[PDB]
Amino acid sequence: FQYPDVYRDETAIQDYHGHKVCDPYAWLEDPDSEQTKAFVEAQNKITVPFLEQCPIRGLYKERMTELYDYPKYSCHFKKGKRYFYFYNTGLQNQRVLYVQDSLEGEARVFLDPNILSDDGTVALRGYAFSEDGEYFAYGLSASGSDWVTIKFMKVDGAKELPDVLERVKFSCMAWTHDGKGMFYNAYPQQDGKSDGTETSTNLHQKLYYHVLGTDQSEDILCAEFPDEPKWMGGAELSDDGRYVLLSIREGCDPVNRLWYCDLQQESNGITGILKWVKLIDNFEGEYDYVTNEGTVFTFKTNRHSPNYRLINIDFTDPEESKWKVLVPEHEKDVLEWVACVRSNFLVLCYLHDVKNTLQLHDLATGALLKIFPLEVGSVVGYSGQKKDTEIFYQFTSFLSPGIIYHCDLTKEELEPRVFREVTVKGIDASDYQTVQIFYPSKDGTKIPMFIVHKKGIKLDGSHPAFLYGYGGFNISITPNYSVSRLIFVRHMGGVLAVANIRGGGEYGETWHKGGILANKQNCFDDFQCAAEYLIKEGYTSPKRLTINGGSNGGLLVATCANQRPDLFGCVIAQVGVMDMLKFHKYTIGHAWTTDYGCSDSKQHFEWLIKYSPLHNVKLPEADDIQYPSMLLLTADHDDRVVPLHSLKFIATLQYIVGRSRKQNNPLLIHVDTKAGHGAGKPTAKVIEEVSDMFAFIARCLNIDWIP
Ligand SMILES: O=C([C@@H]1CC(F)(F)CN1C(=O)CCN1C(=O)c2ccccc2C1=O)N1CCCC1
């Protein structure tokens, strides 16, 4: 196979604070052009076959269907007088929402998204029940877009209502307790397309209030910031449903603004812009509403608390030099989330060395009452509200699909018991072993990393290791269950390894801030030192190492291949960011500037320019050295991270590095149709994806298959 001829527009010179930089494939930024679509068809025209010629691709796909064909369950959660839970019988495209009148009664289907699209590309995204639990609202995203459409249903007898709301994106959903309507966000009718294939930027998001039974055209706009195109304010009601807490965001940082409105002070209902009272009118800290008792509101904050803590604010006595610390910041443990339950019970879930821990405190004083026992892993689900008298929480780990626990908090002795549990026949945990080491980075900083391998393997660098990482946006990559990665471990004798490099939140905002802006390069160094570790201690070798990542992840893997291509022999970047110069001009990109910086700033341009994947591709100077096999994966409806990044990055690779004679390794790309950034991808498509990713690896590193 030969790489297709791509037209280079050498006249595309733009001036960044003096420096002149060329973008000969800037024409790839037009999704609807004939040239772009020819480029796309042409690339998939050489990748599809390639991927299909590997026989393992069928062995993998077959083992995937089987092993992934197990009952996936969500936590039961009570709304009103009925119970609810999502459930997938095994290989169903999208999870279904079942309902029951009693934890012991038979349960029926309440919402089956599977009947709205022959191929599972229409998916539920976001949902909100009325306070009474008698009305349901849900948004559905087509083809993977972020764009959503909210419909309404009457819980009793599952009735469809004529209500429909369009042009919704990154919106909240809050029902007033009077059950009259719902708060939501929508954008201004922009010229062009609005289905997820466009790249137009998103600004001027407003807060509107839909009154059930009316046309969207009659909705009440409740808040807008016309002087600030980027601010995005979500709303929600206090537990007593008297206050509306509006959280104003600008960028992806864990900081917001807290404005409130005493519903009981509105001259006569919600008739327009609200009389917002500006409590926290600055972006210096995160304020997360937990619950409130009267005017006393309790919020999870990080204000002078890198690891987060708890505070009480009386709205009558707002002055900061008065807030009362309920639960002080833990010197080393990070406070992930807090939930109020059974009125005065508080459930906090900490992150102790990238491991979740579940405790239970007293809202009144904050004293610790109980510790819920969990193995090493992650708590992935929870269900317990102020009015509930019971909790439900899901536990997952590298080797455990999941365990749902239950707990009746009305009992004197708080003893929790297994509610639901599920094992994946075909796999035997006792055969694998999880270890967590701490390796040092280029600067001394000890970085954590988990490693799953079979028991008994001899460290002689003879195994193919899959190294994963993300690094950024305060996201913490904790222990999860991936059948698709285990198969790799047992059917290709591979070594799984996940690194928690700086930029993430595993260690408060100081871990987040140590891998962003002027220190972004700290994650690439952090993630490189991980390959060097696995390789040094004989887990694997350079030619048999694979590094995956997507979104912020994919940028990481793409930059590490550009900086140290001699370290890995395979790279798989999914829907990643590649153009660090023009990234902020698309869809919601402007919100990422808080982690990367802005090419618009003479000072930010210098950090970016040095690592921007698309602008640092180079032919290795050493004779015996070449680029690792690379597979970029992206879809046409990814409006989160528009395809132009990968599209442009691939044209560049095949040209600069691809066309030389010493480069035997492949530089392929695969553009999926009817799929977006990742969320909501139907099962079928999911399976198909991993089969490629791993087939590619097998053909590239020449890996045999182990029955
Ligand atoms: O998608 C993203 C970044 C980093 C993230 F944290 F993962 C999520 N993200 C965001 O861009 C998230 C965008 N986003 C908001 O800012 C927001 C405000 C209120 C409600 C809903 C939303 C929402 O989806 N990226 C892809 C490339 C790297 C960053």
XYZ file of C-alpha atoms and ligand atoms in Angstrom:
736
model
C 0.000 0.000 0.000
C 1.095 3.551 -0.815
C 0.113 6.704 1.051
C -2.272 8.945 -0.989
C -1.167 12.207 -2.559
C -2.204 15.151 -0.417
C -2.065 18.710 -1.716
C 0.303 20.941 0.312
C -0.671 24.631 0.392
C 2.750 26.215 0.898
C 1.157 29.674 0.808
C -0.550 29.170 4.175
C 1.782 31.221 6.344
C 0.402 32.796 9.514
C 2.275 35.095 11.871
C 2.377 34.200 15.545
C 3.949 37.086 17.441
C 6.647 37.307 14.785
C 7.358 33.643 14.143
C 6.053 32.480 10.808
C 4.501 29.012 10.810
C 3.182 27.036 7.814
C -0.028 24.967 7.748
C -0.098 23.398 4.238
C -3.058 21.219 5.236
C -5.168 23.963 6.775
C -7.640 23.144 4.012
C -8.335 19.937 5.887
C -10.237 22.086 8.338
C -13.225 22.221 6.008
C -15.320 19.138 6.759
C -17.832 19.573 3.912
C -15.356 20.227 1.068
C -14.840 17.704 -1.747
C -11.075 17.669 -1.122
C -11.392 16.843 2.573
C -13.878 14.024 1.995
C -11.601 12.622 -0.718
C -8.712 12.714 1.702
C -10.790 10.874 4.294
C -12.142 8.172 1.973
C -8.642 7.745 0.561
C -7.071 7.091 3.993
C -9.733 4.706 5.298
C -9.305 3.036 1.902
C -5.861 1.814 2.903
C -6.329 1.394 6.642
C -9.486 -0.713 6.625
C -7.942 -3.468 4.493
C -4.695 -3.268 6.450
C -6.528 -3.719 9.730
C -8.602 -6.570 8.257
C -5.651 -8.574 6.912
C -4.572 -9.497 10.465
C -6.158 -12.858 11.434
C -5.930 -12.031 15.139
C -8.436 -9.275 14.500
C -11.012 -12.049 14.239
C -9.776 -14.073 17.177
C -9.859 -10.923 19.322
C -13.303 -9.830 18.130
C -14.695 -13.307 18.839
C -13.222 -13.436 22.329
C -14.450 -9.902 22.867
C -18.084 -10.659 22.063
C -17.963 -13.585 24.462
C -16.146 -12.046 27.433
C -17.886 -8.667 27.090
C -21.202 -10.522 26.988
C -21.897 -10.181 30.694
C -24.657 -8.375 32.714
C -23.750 -4.720 33.267
C -25.644 -3.083 36.164
C -26.069 0.427 37.578
C -26.848 1.377 41.180
C -30.514 1.220 42.111
C -31.675 4.743 42.928
C -35.008 5.834 44.332
C -36.896 8.784 42.924
C -40.246 9.436 44.547
C -41.992 6.153 45.341
C -40.261 4.025 42.710
C -36.843 2.476 42.299
C -34.660 2.801 39.206
C -31.514 1.282 37.677
C -29.809 0.979 34.293
C -29.112 -2.553 33.090
C -27.478 -4.181 30.052
C -28.209 -7.854 29.625
C -24.798 -8.282 28.033
C -24.297 -7.150 24.425
C -27.150 -4.666 24.043
C -26.115 -1.527 22.172
C -27.184 0.996 24.845
C -28.096 0.488 28.527
C -31.794 0.469 29.420
C -33.653 2.205 32.259
C -35.902 -0.111 34.294
C -38.319 0.863 37.067
C -39.934 -0.921 39.993
C -42.470 0.077 42.591
C -40.527 -1.830 45.200
C -37.014 -3.160 45.679
C -38.725 -6.577 45.710
C -41.268 -6.176 42.917
C -40.946 -7.173 39.270
C -39.260 -4.498 37.175
C -40.343 -3.198 33.773
C -38.623 -1.193 31.032
C -38.984 2.540 31.562
C -36.693 3.799 28.815
C -35.119 1.736 26.057
C -32.898 3.937 23.820
C -32.251 0.837 21.738
C -35.446 1.274 19.732
C -34.590 4.730 18.448
C -31.834 3.661 16.072
C -31.141 0.423 14.240
C -27.418 0.895 15.013
C -27.403 2.285 18.562
C -26.152 5.744 17.532
C -28.863 7.628 19.449
C -28.130 7.826 23.128
C -29.449 9.151 26.386
C -27.230 11.917 27.725
C -28.367 13.555 30.935
C -31.605 13.060 32.825
C -33.479 14.695 35.661
C -36.516 13.665 37.691
C -38.992 16.101 39.241
C -38.849 16.441 42.995
C -41.987 14.308 43.309
C -40.567 11.796 40.813
C -43.699 11.943 38.684
C -42.071 13.534 35.642
C -38.887 12.638 33.754
C -36.724 14.698 31.376
C -33.966 13.321 29.160
C -31.593 14.477 26.460
C -30.506 12.323 23.550
C -27.346 12.817 21.439
C -27.303 11.572 17.855
C -24.213 10.108 16.228
C -21.993 11.000 19.161
C -22.503 14.741 19.015
C -22.412 16.911 22.160
C -25.537 18.621 20.828
C -28.575 17.330 22.703
C -32.387 17.354 22.521
C -34.469 17.142 25.675
C -37.738 15.282 25.607
C -40.182 14.690 28.495
C -42.041 11.639 29.874
C -44.671 11.007 32.558
C -43.228 8.408 34.907
C -46.623 6.819 35.540
C -47.289 4.551 32.605
C -44.245 6.022 30.864
C -46.039 8.721 28.861
C -44.407 10.683 26.088
C -45.109 14.403 26.222
C -45.109 16.821 23.258
C -42.456 18.898 25.043
C -39.186 19.144 23.137
C -36.181 21.451 23.554
C -33.567 22.002 20.824
C -30.090 23.588 20.557
C -28.976 22.269 23.940
C -25.310 21.660 24.682
C -23.319 21.333 27.924
C -26.489 22.128 29.868
C -27.802 21.600 33.369
C -31.263 20.253 34.143
C -33.015 21.369 37.332
C -36.693 21.083 38.161
C -38.201 23.651 40.445
C -39.815 21.920 43.416
C -43.175 23.352 42.375
C -42.894 20.922 39.477
C -43.872 23.727 37.123
C -40.834 23.619 34.846
C -37.116 23.027 34.373
C -33.903 25.087 34.089
C -31.689 24.295 31.123
C -29.034 25.836 28.894
C -29.224 26.565 25.155
C -27.114 28.409 22.609
C -28.027 31.147 20.116
C -29.255 30.018 16.693
C -25.974 30.146 14.768
C -25.746 30.206 10.978
C -24.589 26.927 9.455
C -24.926 23.343 10.690
C -25.624 22.088 14.213
C -25.368 18.303 14.160
C -21.831 17.688 15.355
C -20.043 17.925 11.995
C -19.479 21.693 12.269
C -16.563 23.360 14.007
C -18.137 26.732 14.737
C -17.116 28.017 18.174
C -19.628 27.963 20.991
C -20.288 31.190 22.836
C -23.103 33.043 24.551
C -24.649 30.064 26.265
C -27.705 31.152 28.203
C -29.862 29.839 31.016
C -33.544 29.459 30.103
C -36.466 28.031 32.068
C -38.903 25.624 30.370
C -42.452 25.616 31.728
C -43.969 22.182 31.104
C -46.795 22.228 28.562
C -45.473 25.181 26.550
C -43.483 25.737 23.359
C -39.754 26.244 23.728
C -40.271 29.561 21.975
C -42.069 30.793 25.083
C -39.246 29.879 27.470
C -38.008 32.329 30.062
C -34.360 33.370 29.701
C -33.133 33.573 33.309
C -29.495 34.604 32.946
C -27.007 35.732 30.395
C -23.596 37.355 30.310
C -23.547 39.279 26.990
C -20.254 40.914 27.960
C -18.756 37.449 28.476
C -19.111 34.959 25.571
C -17.372 32.187 27.516
C -19.165 32.099 30.855
C -21.427 29.098 31.288
C -23.702 29.005 34.307
C -25.443 25.880 35.475
C -28.220 25.986 38.030
C -29.670 23.741 40.694
C -32.069 23.967 43.630
C -31.130 23.730 47.281
C -32.515 20.631 48.984
C -35.445 22.613 50.366
C -36.027 23.860 46.823
C -36.051 27.519 47.886
C -32.716 28.669 46.482
C -31.358 28.360 42.968
C -27.608 28.049 43.031
C -26.016 29.207 39.772
C -22.435 28.004 39.238
C -20.597 30.147 36.683
C -17.741 28.488 34.822
C -15.211 29.859 32.372
C -12.668 27.291 31.270
C -12.129 23.791 32.640
C -10.582 24.699 35.974
C -12.037 23.540 39.302
C -13.109 27.106 40.060
C -16.469 28.772 39.648
C -18.724 31.659 40.696
C -21.626 31.202 43.112
C -24.677 33.401 42.584
C -27.999 32.639 44.320
C -31.623 33.680 44.112
C -34.200 33.307 46.910
C -37.103 31.875 44.916
C -39.287 33.119 47.763
C -38.275 36.702 46.965
C -39.430 36.798 43.334
C -42.145 39.427 43.008
C -44.289 36.817 41.269
C -42.665 33.652 39.966
C -39.885 33.166 37.438
C -40.782 35.732 34.793
C -37.349 36.730 33.491
C -33.836 37.650 34.550
C -33.568 36.727 38.225
C -32.554 38.819 41.210
C -29.254 37.027 41.596
C -27.280 37.731 44.768
C -23.561 37.533 43.995
C -22.039 35.438 46.762
C -18.697 34.218 45.469
C -18.112 36.651 42.618
C -14.670 35.433 41.565
C -12.884 32.511 39.949
C -10.485 31.772 42.827
C -12.047 28.588 44.122
C -14.396 25.676 43.622
C -17.650 25.727 45.581
C -19.710 22.545 45.408
C -23.165 22.582 46.981
C -23.537 19.493 49.200
C -26.666 20.373 51.183
C -28.087 23.211 53.257
C -29.894 23.655 56.564
C -31.695 26.970 56.541
C -29.426 29.752 55.393
C -26.418 27.619 56.272
C -25.117 26.124 53.040
C -22.359 23.510 53.036
C -19.970 23.351 50.010
C -17.013 21.231 48.954
C -14.283 23.768 48.173
C -10.563 23.938 47.279
C -10.235 27.518 48.402
C -6.764 27.372 49.939
C -7.310 23.629 49.938
C -5.436 21.817 47.126
C -6.862 18.513 48.364
C -10.330 19.951 49.009
C -12.287 20.234 52.260
C -15.717 21.226 53.633
C -17.104 24.590 54.689
C -20.288 26.220 55.954
C -21.519 29.570 54.714
C -24.455 31.347 56.317
C -26.044 33.490 53.653
C -27.033 35.953 56.363
C -23.393 36.233 57.455
C -21.559 35.889 54.095
C -18.227 37.505 55.005
C -15.445 34.957 54.366
C -13.838 35.526 57.748
C -16.795 33.605 59.152
C -17.148 30.498 57.036
C -16.834 27.527 59.357
C -14.602 24.601 58.437
C -16.699 21.458 58.898
C -14.109 18.911 57.642
C -10.498 20.220 57.255
C -8.417 19.454 54.171
C -6.548 16.178 54.420
C -2.844 16.756 54.147
C -2.446 13.890 51.670
C -5.879 12.486 50.828
C -7.978 14.115 48.097
C -11.727 14.667 48.634
C -13.421 13.473 45.404
C -17.096 13.930 46.155
C -19.513 14.343 49.056
C -23.169 13.331 49.254
C -25.721 14.136 51.952
C -28.102 11.357 52.948
C -30.693 10.545 55.613
C -30.832 14.265 56.402
C -27.817 14.643 58.677
C -25.520 11.976 57.276
C -22.584 12.834 55.058
C -20.876 10.346 52.767
C -17.393 11.371 51.696
C -15.268 9.380 49.244
C -11.518 10.099 49.375
C -8.739 9.214 46.978
C -5.940 7.577 48.954
C -3.043 6.882 46.612
C -5.320 6.572 43.585
C -7.543 4.222 45.554
C -11.059 5.121 46.647
C -12.101 5.001 50.304
C -15.685 5.434 51.548
C -16.442 7.052 54.913
C -19.505 8.456 56.690
C -19.678 11.664 58.746
C -22.167 13.725 60.785
C -23.433 16.810 58.939
C -23.823 18.555 62.289
C -20.207 18.349 63.492
C -18.299 16.621 60.704
C -16.982 13.897 62.995
C -16.256 10.533 61.343
C -18.848 7.870 62.153
C -18.004 4.885 59.956
C -15.594 3.467 57.432
C -16.943 1.413 54.557
C -14.536 -1.443 53.657
C -13.326 -1.589 50.047
C -10.506 -3.446 48.320
C -8.055 -1.510 46.182
C -9.992 0.064 43.312
C -12.605 2.694 42.387
C -16.120 3.555 43.549
C -17.981 4.003 40.223
C -21.581 4.581 41.249
C -23.534 5.960 44.211
C -27.181 6.496 45.100
C -28.233 8.350 48.215
C -30.063 11.649 48.558
C -31.036 13.826 51.505
C -34.529 12.341 51.592
C -33.325 8.760 51.180
C -32.627 6.548 54.177
C -30.213 4.287 52.324
C -27.185 4.289 50.026
C -25.968 2.122 47.135
C -22.395 2.167 45.807
C -20.547 0.293 43.040
C -17.003 -0.996 43.344
C -14.842 -1.873 40.345
C -11.174 -2.751 39.871
C -8.732 -4.075 37.258
C -9.917 -7.623 37.965
C -13.462 -7.106 39.203
C -16.311 -6.123 36.858
C -18.219 -4.661 39.761
C -19.937 -5.119 43.100
C -22.942 -3.096 44.187
C -23.304 -2.599 47.921
C -26.388 -1.579 49.882
C -26.881 0.090 53.258
C -30.041 0.790 55.269
C -29.054 3.877 57.271
C -32.132 3.571 59.495
C -30.496 0.708 61.400
C -28.603 1.269 64.627
C -25.600 -0.807 63.544
C -24.565 0.403 60.094
C -23.651 -2.924 58.509
C -23.372 -2.911 54.696
C -23.958 -6.023 52.598
C -23.363 -7.155 48.997
C -26.413 -6.319 46.932
C -25.262 -7.313 43.468
C -22.078 -8.965 42.215
C -20.830 -10.217 38.838
C -17.919 -12.359 37.666
C -16.686 -12.698 34.082
C -16.379 -16.416 33.339
C -13.428 -16.991 31.037
C -11.113 -14.992 33.282
C -9.573 -15.985 36.631
C -8.239 -13.184 38.843
C -6.069 -15.525 40.893
C -4.010 -15.822 37.701
C -3.074 -12.135 37.469
C -1.471 -9.769 39.914
C -1.850 -6.044 40.478
C 1.008 -4.014 41.860
C 1.468 -0.275 42.369
C 5.004 1.045 42.195
C 6.302 4.601 42.493
C 8.977 5.568 39.958
C 10.852 8.927 39.870
C 10.552 11.372 36.980
C 13.214 13.493 35.264
C 12.959 15.873 38.218
C 12.826 13.628 41.272
C 9.054 13.600 41.686
C 7.857 10.098 42.615
C 5.050 9.163 40.232
C 2.525 6.350 40.914
C 1.646 3.718 38.325
C -0.332 0.451 38.424
C 0.869 -2.694 36.644
C -1.193 -5.778 35.846
C 0.560 -8.919 34.621
C 0.191 -12.680 35.027
C 1.542 -14.300 38.186
C 4.875 -15.963 37.480
C 6.124 -13.965 34.499
C 9.872 -13.378 34.553
C 10.995 -9.784 34.117
C 13.260 -10.176 31.082
C 11.936 -7.463 28.780
C 10.395 -10.152 26.634
C 6.770 -9.138 27.089
C 4.589 -6.640 25.117
C 3.405 -3.953 27.556
C 0.476 -1.554 26.978
C 1.184 1.733 28.777
C -1.721 4.132 29.346
C -1.963 7.754 30.546
C -3.936 11.036 30.274
C -2.351 13.745 32.441
C -4.541 16.821 32.719
C -7.756 18.611 33.559
C -7.657 17.390 37.108
C -8.934 14.034 35.805
C -7.657 11.100 37.889
C -7.140 7.772 36.122
C -8.218 5.326 38.866
C -8.585 1.496 38.720
C -11.229 0.320 36.289
C -12.316 -2.937 34.652
C -11.421 -3.422 31.015
C -12.100 -6.855 29.537
C -10.557 -5.587 26.310
C -7.253 -4.997 28.111
C -7.279 -8.265 30.040
C -7.763 -10.287 26.861
C -4.560 -8.523 25.859
C -2.887 -9.766 29.048
C -3.972 -13.392 28.683
C -4.318 -13.896 24.924
C -1.227 -11.953 23.827
C 0.733 -12.397 27.052
C 0.870 -8.653 27.504
C 1.601 -6.360 30.425
C -0.913 -3.683 31.335
C 0.417 -0.504 32.959
C -1.289 2.837 33.843
C 0.673 5.940 34.898
C -0.761 8.754 36.982
C 1.456 11.552 35.655
C 1.237 15.191 36.738
C -1.608 17.333 35.411
C -4.199 14.936 36.762
C -5.929 15.253 40.109
C -4.729 12.149 41.963
C -2.992 14.568 44.342
C -5.111 17.699 44.525
C -4.756 20.747 42.341
C -0.996 20.762 42.922
C -0.784 17.546 40.873
C -3.079 19.204 38.369
C -1.055 22.428 38.270
C 2.254 20.578 37.999
C 1.383 19.364 34.546
C -0.251 22.371 32.909
C 0.682 25.691 31.274
C 4.419 26.361 31.672
C 4.871 22.873 33.120
C 2.905 20.870 30.595
C 6.128 19.272 29.445
C 6.227 17.799 32.933
C 3.703 15.111 31.903
C 5.579 14.073 28.778
C 8.703 13.691 30.941
C 6.625 11.912 33.572
C 5.116 9.545 31.030
C 8.428 8.893 29.319
C 10.109 7.987 32.595
C 7.403 5.326 32.854
C 8.405 3.577 29.631
C 11.996 3.762 30.773
C 10.913 2.149 34.026
C 8.989 -0.805 32.586
C 11.847 -1.269 30.121
C 14.585 -0.970 32.739
C 13.102 -3.495 35.139
C 12.638 -5.918 32.283
C 8.872 -5.774 31.787
C 9.236 -4.985 28.103
C 11.558 -3.584 25.445
C 11.339 -0.551 23.141
C 10.263 -2.429 20.023
C 7.447 -4.223 21.863
C 6.019 -1.326 23.896
C 2.698 0.314 23.106
C 1.424 3.594 24.514
C -2.276 4.489 24.218
C -4.187 7.642 25.129
C -7.166 9.659 23.897
C -8.297 13.300 23.985
C -5.757 14.884 26.316
C -4.356 11.355 26.323
C -3.825 11.117 22.575
C -1.912 14.397 22.599
C 0.377 12.943 25.249
C 1.094 9.783 23.258
C 1.569 11.829 20.055
C 4.086 14.181 21.680
C 6.032 11.328 23.251
C 6.429 9.726 19.851
C 7.737 13.025 18.521
C 10.146 13.562 21.383
C 11.377 10.006 21.993
C 10.301 7.825 19.070
C 13.007 5.302 20.044
C 11.192 4.406 23.252
C 8.080 2.741 21.824
C 7.280 0.517 18.877
C 3.559 1.289 18.666
C 1.349 4.307 19.298
C -2.444 4.558 19.311
C -3.909 8.035 19.667
C -7.655 8.359 19.952
C -9.587 11.571 19.201
C -6.624 13.629 20.288
C -5.612 17.271 20.200
C -2.822 17.936 17.687
C -2.980 21.560 16.564
C -2.108 23.470 19.715
C -2.132 26.725 17.753
C -5.667 26.721 16.364
C -7.232 24.392 18.938
C -9.066 27.210 20.727
C -11.010 28.287 17.636
C -13.182 25.215 17.386
C -16.408 24.167 19.073
C -15.621 24.315 22.807
C -11.853 24.450 22.546
C -11.624 27.915 24.116
C -12.333 26.241 27.486
C -9.078 24.256 27.416
C -6.840 27.325 27.448
C -6.779 27.067 31.249
C -4.632 23.905 30.972
C -2.571 24.628 27.821
C -2.438 28.401 27.309
C -3.420 30.487 24.280
C -1.437 30.883 21.054
C -2.818 34.422 21.163
C -0.385 35.228 23.943
C 3.233 35.923 23.064
C 4.245 34.099 26.250
C 1.937 31.064 25.911
C 2.968 30.519 22.320
C 6.456 29.527 23.482
C 5.285 26.602 25.604
C 2.902 25.315 22.954
C 5.178 25.746 19.934
C 7.751 23.511 21.618
C 5.412 20.536 21.935
C 2.501 21.115 19.557
C 2.425 17.613 17.947
C 1.547 18.913 14.477
C 4.505 21.320 14.468
C 7.291 19.130 15.872
C 7.149 16.100 13.559
C 10.707 15.397 12.383
C 12.769 12.699 10.673
C 15.067 11.115 13.292
C 18.679 12.182 12.816
C 20.072 8.741 13.704
C 20.339 6.207 10.891
C 19.123 3.197 12.887
C 16.114 5.141 14.232
C 12.550 5.546 12.924
C 9.016 6.511 13.994
C 6.844 3.954 15.804
C 3.877 2.423 13.992
C 1.047 4.910 14.526
C -2.729 4.489 14.405
C -4.872 7.586 14.843
C -8.539 6.984 15.543
C -11.317 9.530 15.153
C -14.882 9.903 13.898
C -16.730 12.469 11.779
C -19.217 13.539 14.460
C -16.652 14.296 17.125
C -17.603 17.881 17.890
C -15.646 17.818 21.148
C -12.289 17.465 19.406
C -12.960 18.125 15.733
C -11.391 15.652 13.233
C -9.189 18.313 11.631
C -6.577 17.731 14.332
C -5.971 14.081 13.419
C -6.620 14.711 9.725
C -3.875 17.356 9.589
C -1.520 15.460 11.863
C -1.676 12.363 9.636
C -1.015 14.208 6.369
C 2.067 15.633 8.071
C 3.382 12.251 9.265
C 3.079 10.392 5.940
C 4.842 13.330 4.287
C 7.765 14.267 6.560
C 8.387 10.867 8.136
C 6.232 8.654 5.945
C 7.862 9.351 2.580
C 11.489 8.625 3.621
C 12.914 5.172 2.801
C 14.166 4.216 6.263
C 10.631 4.319 7.623
C 9.173 0.847 7.288
C 6.626 1.350 10.100
C 3.045 2.361 9.216
C 1.405 5.759 9.728
C -2.337 5.089 9.434
C -5.580 6.846 10.377
C -9.167 5.620 10.697
C -12.191 7.926 10.531
C -15.423 6.389 11.841
C -18.893 7.483 10.682
C -21.817 8.269 12.962
C -19.512 8.362 15.969
C -18.360 11.205 18.182
C -15.717 11.942 20.795
C -16.499 8.753 22.655
C -19.432 8.937 25.042
C -22.479 6.935 24.063
C -20.633 4.797 21.538
C -22.884 1.745 21.101
C -21.526 -1.635 22.168
C -21.166 -2.959 18.605
C -18.967 -0.010 17.631
C -16.983 -0.298 20.876
C -16.052 -3.920 20.212
C -15.140 -3.103 16.608
C -12.769 -0.400 17.842
C -10.701 -2.430 20.322
C -10.417 -5.205 17.736
C -8.637 -2.785 15.421
C -6.451 -1.205 18.119
C -5.173 -4.607 19.169
C -5.113 -6.209 15.758
C -2.935 -3.287 14.637
C -0.553 -4.014 17.517
C -0.347 -7.715 16.697
C 0.438 -7.128 13.052
C 2.868 -4.330 13.921
C 4.844 -5.987 16.708
C 4.285 -9.427 15.151
C 2.552 -10.869 18.235
C 1.236 -14.427 18.328
C -2.134 -15.455 19.776
C -2.472 -17.536 22.945
C -5.546 -19.776 23.230
O -13.079 17.563 26.423
C -12.078 18.112 26.888
C -12.171 18.987 28.130
C -11.367 18.427 29.274
C -12.367 17.550 30.042
F -12.242 17.778 31.372
F -12.120 16.247 29.761
C -13.795 17.924 29.587
N -13.528 19.053 28.680
C -14.337 20.049 28.284
O -14.065 20.755 27.305
C -15.553 20.016 28.847
C -16.497 21.031 28.169
N -17.597 21.304 29.077
C -17.694 22.392 29.856
O -16.866 23.278 29.970
C -18.985 22.340 30.630
C -19.556 23.211 31.574
C -20.793 22.820 32.120
C -21.426 21.621 31.727
C -20.844 20.760 30.781
C -19.612 21.154 30.243
C -18.683 20.512 29.239
O -18.900 19.435 28.683
N -10.863 17.957 26.338
C -10.593 17.162 25.143
C -9.162 17.567 24.784
C -8.542 17.903 26.083
C -9.629 18.529 26.908
